[PDB]
UniProtKB/Swiss-Prot annotation:
Family classification: Belongs to the glycosyl hydrolase 22 family.
Gene: LYZ
Enzyme class at the top of the EC tree: hydrolase
Subunit structure, interactors included: Monomer.
Assigned EC number: 3.2.1.17
Compartment(s): Secreted
Name the record gives this protein: Lysozyme C
Organism expressing this protein natively: Homo sapiens
Protein purpose: Lysozymes have primarily a bacteriolytic function; those in tissues and body fluids are associated with the monocyte-macrophage system and enhance the activity of immunoagents.
Amino acid sequence: KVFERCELARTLKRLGMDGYRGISLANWMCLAKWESGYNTRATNYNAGDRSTDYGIFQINSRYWCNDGKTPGAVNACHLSCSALLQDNIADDVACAKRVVRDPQGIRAWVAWRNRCQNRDVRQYVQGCGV
């Protein structure tokens, strides 16, 4: 499923992401935009290290979900990577919360640094009623 901006804004709010571990809603929106274009079915194979990024938040199989095929990986979120490809983002949200619970926080996603850090990200939630 490809979310519309405000529709996702509202969904994330309901899911308790606003201010999660100090991370504002607008930041999570910026993240999803740059990682998947708000597409829950998006996947990206990293030939470099043999892992795959899955779903809305492009969660990596090296550490967060199990795909069976990534070498040396762990599955911190206790989920099959398949779970992150559903149209519902409940699993994605619970796993993303897990990711930021580690020291790096939101910085674990390099695109967040490149595209969202130190920028005015209010645009991502403007007019959405959240």
